[PDB]
Amino acid sequence: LRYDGRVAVVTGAGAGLGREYALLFAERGAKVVVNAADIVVDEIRKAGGEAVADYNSVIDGAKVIEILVNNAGILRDRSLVKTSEQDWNLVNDVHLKGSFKCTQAAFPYMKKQNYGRIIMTSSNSGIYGNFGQVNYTAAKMGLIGLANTVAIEGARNNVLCNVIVPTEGILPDILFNELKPKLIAPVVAYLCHESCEDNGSYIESAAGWATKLHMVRGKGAVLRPSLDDPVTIEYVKDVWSNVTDMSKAKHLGAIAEASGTLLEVLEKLKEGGGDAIEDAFEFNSKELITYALGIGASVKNAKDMRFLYENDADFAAIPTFFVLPGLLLQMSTDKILHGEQYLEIVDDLPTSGTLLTNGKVFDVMDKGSGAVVVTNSESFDESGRLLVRNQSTTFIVGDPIAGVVPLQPAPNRQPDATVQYTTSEDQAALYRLSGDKNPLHIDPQMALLAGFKTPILHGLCTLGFSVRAVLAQFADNNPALFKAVKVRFSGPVIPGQTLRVDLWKQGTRINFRTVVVETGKEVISGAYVDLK
Amino acid sequence: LRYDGRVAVVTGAGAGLGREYALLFAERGAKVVVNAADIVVDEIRKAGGEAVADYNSVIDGAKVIEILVNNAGILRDRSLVKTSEQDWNLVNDVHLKGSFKCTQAAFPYMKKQNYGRIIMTSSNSGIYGNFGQVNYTAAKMGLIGLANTVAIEGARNNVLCNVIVPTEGILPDILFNELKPKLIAPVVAYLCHESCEDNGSYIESAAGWATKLHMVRGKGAVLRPSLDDPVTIEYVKDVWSNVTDMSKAKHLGAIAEASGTLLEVLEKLKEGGGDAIEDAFEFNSKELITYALGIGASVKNAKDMRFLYENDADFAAIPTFFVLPGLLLQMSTDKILHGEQYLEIVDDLPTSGTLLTNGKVFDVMDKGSGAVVVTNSESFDESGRLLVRNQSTTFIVGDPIAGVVPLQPAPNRQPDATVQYTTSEDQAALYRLSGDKNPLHIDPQMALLAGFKTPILHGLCTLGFSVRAVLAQFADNNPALFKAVKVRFSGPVIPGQTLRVDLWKQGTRINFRTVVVETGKEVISGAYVDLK
């Protein structure tokens, strides 16, 4: 890996980092300008290489120019109140202004040639701050903003610009003896080679180790209940833990990205409001298979492999998996017997990704000794495609409007088919791993407090078993044929009990009901699956 | 939420952002200095408030001073080659130098009072870069490095410093009409209130929305095979995808953190070398329970609740769970019949966290038509406590040294106890979710290619069942009494088959063997558990 036919300019090449950038560049074929200087020139030459000396100050970069590594620097470390005009000025001049001048003078030559490699030297002191160094930390972070723009103005003509970040009392020998300039030079050298396509990077390096730094941005938070309200200081406070929550932080690539996300916020806020809920749902094959096993899919069934092994050619979710994002969001906060469920697949389903879901109360009813709340939820993928409609009906102890999906009673005749599934005693202990942690499905004491003699199976688990019976029986176990499910949860199932699913075929629609065999009791009623 | 007994200074308060910072501060009780100015003073006064005018330039901050929001600015947008002396200078002077001067003059008053709130104005242009703006982007990122140090020098006396980041052609009305200065003012106001303890923050805000930005740092990568080798450009290249891998990126709080991690790298490299492997293992109760169910723990057993429900007062891992970090790391790359396993718990086990694990080949042997590789692994928690020793022996078709843990043959007499466990047909389909995805435990075609007639259960799953028999039988199901396990995997188990574990008690040590009941064949041999 060489640098034949290349000219490199190193500022502050008299010593330290610069000096070693000089030697390595010459070592590997490049002809070098050492911007003190004479000692390095003669040493490069004697080692068998081509190089010229330069005595110019970085303020005067035009004469320097006539690869560019900006490395010259000075120190004038003072406290804040003790940092004078000359202190501020001389540090800002050599580091920031100087790098600008020198990059300025070199660029035309690099762009008209369609090849260029520029380097700025920043430091952790700039990145993090450091007591008693305002001038220097202002300057070295300034070099990052300089580079960010030099990178962009050079991009389309192969003129690239990156940032190198070279990291009392007594150090341990192993550390002190590895903190040497010779070990950082090759990172800089690689960032200045033809094969490198890095542009706008921050690379930290020392002691023969390197990493990349970049800025990330939190999800953040809207600062008013609606578009029709102002922003009050009291709201900013009440919402500050969300503003500064970095747990979902992301890196943006360019200013237009930073600018284009505001629209989304405003539109969301406008279409609905502050009485809406939002959350992220990450998944991969692991969660898909965990769920399928939770609802009884088994490798004893050849047709189930597709739901149980990620490398199967037909690997897919059982589509009721997509009740979870809606479910978890709606039970995460309160703004509770799960009584009815509706789920609509609207588009082809993926096998992984990061979903965005919303939550809105759709309808509230009054049933004497109780209230019914109908909650509507939509799930979208990362690019913004709508995947799922979730409508859930809850009863809170203690006339539906249009758009509330009604139940359909069983066709008054013998079922066309029946399917029996035995559940295991661990069915709920397994199903709850898909995210529904309610203690009444596992903890005897909490089940009792919720009015059950033993822990009961999740209603949505029983729905899972039922949709599986529908799909094996009427859709050849093809999940892409599933359109929608609607269900009333009408009774408790105990893990270990046996289910029978009664099915009636009526065109597109499979009516069904689910009975616990040992008691004779109905546990899913008024229910159907729509196929495609 | 008011600002009584507070004096605030706003630069560039004549218009825009500044103007509205002026009004809100006065609106809520503070007496204000509007640094054009007269129009704002008279308007603050008429609205019923106290404020004075100021005509001083930000370069001359001493006269301004006699809360500080630095907001004055200018624009001189030029291309890189077209940015002159006056262009660079005037933008750097008003933004960067000006903010310094003004913060400089105000600090003494804030520190000797033990109360202070300072604000710098940066921009996304600085943070990301923007074509044709070098002077401005250099300056606005410079303000971040300025603030980073002002924050630190003010911290111990309640003098806090934060950064506000206020975000052609035709915009949509909804966006254009919300991009107004009045909506950003309260974020700045909150960052300048007594209740706020934010120091060194970057807060982005616009259109009644806000988030926090911060710099993160990748795990990075060592740039040489050992401490005895130099760093070559060729190695930096070969290793560059690891250097710039941001998938494990973390935020550091201070420069000393950035500096203190280098030592660890050097020491690691020294103790061993480049012939070692490293990886991260994240877990919580979900993975713990997924694993316990995978090895047969069941809510039918009262003593198993502790392994199956996260809110149980005795919630714990079954300790063989901690074979996984070692296992996954060692099978992730090659640098394969699993023949023997050893696992030592060295310290109290947690129920979540992020583990660090290493991998080193300990011994290689030559067994005629095959080679034995003994691999050693250590797992540590986040603070650095050693939790696990993992020694695994593999056979690769086609004299052990000290420190290779030997097998111990069964005591020659009838077992003291026996335990029978039926596995389910889905045992491997479930167990593989704990991370061992080898297709031969699930896919018939791949099992065959690996020389098995049907998919076989993972050997480590069978070890799990066996240690469970040991713990229920001899340790009262107390996982904290488990010290170590050693095993030869001596035959295949098919999911659905029945296991019997034969146990012999001999003080601290429980010898055991595991037999498939239906065939009569031994599947775990030469094996023991050490208890505490």
Chain B residues inside the 8 Å CB shell of A137: 145-146, 148-149
d(CA A33, CA A64): 9
Q: Which helix (H) or strand (E) holds A505?
A: strand A498-506
Task: List the structure tokens of A354.
Answer: 């990061």
In chain A, what are the domain boundaries?
1-218, 219-273, 274-532
Helix/strand/coil percentages in chain B, nearest 5 = 35, 25, 40
Burial A348-386 (b: 16+ CB within 10 A, else e): ebeeeeebbbbbeebbeeeeeeeebbbbbbbbbbeeeee
| B4, B216, B236, best to mutate vs chain A, most A CBs in 10 Å | B236
> Which is nearest to A525 in space by CA: A406, A431, A444?
A406
User: Which residue is associated with the tokens 């806020």?
Assistant: A269
DSSP class of residue A250 equals B
A125 annotated ligand binder:
no
CB pairs under 8 A between A and B: 411
How close, in Å, is residue A464 to chain B by CA atoms? 18
- Is A251 annotated in a binding site? The answer is no
Report which residue type is found at A366.
Answer: D
Technique used by the depositors: X-ray
Q: Cβ A142–B142 below 8 Å, yes or no? A: yes
CA-to-CA separations, B183 to A398, B34, B36, B176, B209, in angstroms, rounded: 42, 19, 22, 13, 8
Quick one: tokens of A370?
């109780």
Q: Which of A3, A136, A421, A528 is catalytic?
A: A136
Cβ distance of A223 and B236 shorter than 8 Å:
no
Q: Check B3, B55, B115, B136 and give the catalytic one.
A: B136
Contact A465, A474 (CB under 8 A): no
Burial category of A271 from C-beta neighbours within 10 Å (exposed 0-12, middle 13-18, buried 19 and up): exposed
Q: Cite the DSSP H helix spans in A309-363.
A: 324-332
User: What would the two tokens of residue A83 be?
Assistant: 């940092």
Quick one: fold of B219-273? Helix Hairpins (1.10.287)
Neighbours of A264 (CB within 10 A): 11
CB crowding A35-51: b at 16 or more within 10 Å, else e:
bebeebbebbeeeebeb
Count of other CB atoms within 10 angstroms of residue B256? 11
Q: Are A514 and A529 in contact (CB under 8 A)?
A: no
- Cβ–Cβ below 8 Å for A309 and B81: no
Cβ–Cβ gap B145/A127 under 8 Å:
yes
SS3 at position A511: strand
Nearest to B148 among A107, A129, A149 (CB): A129
| The 3-state secondary structure of B439-489, one letter per residue | HHHCCHHHHHHCCCCCCCCCHHHHHHHHHHHHHHHHCCCCHHHEEEEEEEE
List the single residue in B186, B220, B299 with the smallest CB-CB distance to A236.
B186
User: A37-46 and A16-27 are packed helices; what angle lies between their axes, rounded to 10 degrees?
Assistant: 30
Query: Looking at the domain that runs over B1-218, which CATH code has it been given?
Result: 3.40.50.720
Provide the 3-class DSSP secondary structure of residue B248. coil
Q: Give exposure, B32-65, as e/b (b: 16+ Cβ within 10 Å).
A: bbbbebeebbebbeeeebebebbebebeebeebb
Query: What's the rounded Cα separation, in Å, for the pair A514 and A524?
Result: 5
Cβ-count burial of B146 within 10 angstroms (0-12 exposed, 13-18 middle, 19+ buried)?
Answer: buried
> Could you tell me the sign of the dihedral formed by the alpha carbons of B62, B68, B74, B80, in that order?
positive
Instruction: Supply the CATH classification number for the domain B274-532.
Output: 3.10.129.10
Please confirm, yes or no, whether A136 is among the known catalytic residues.
yes
Breaks following residues of chain A (C-to-N distance > 2.5 Å): 35, 66, 167, 335, 398
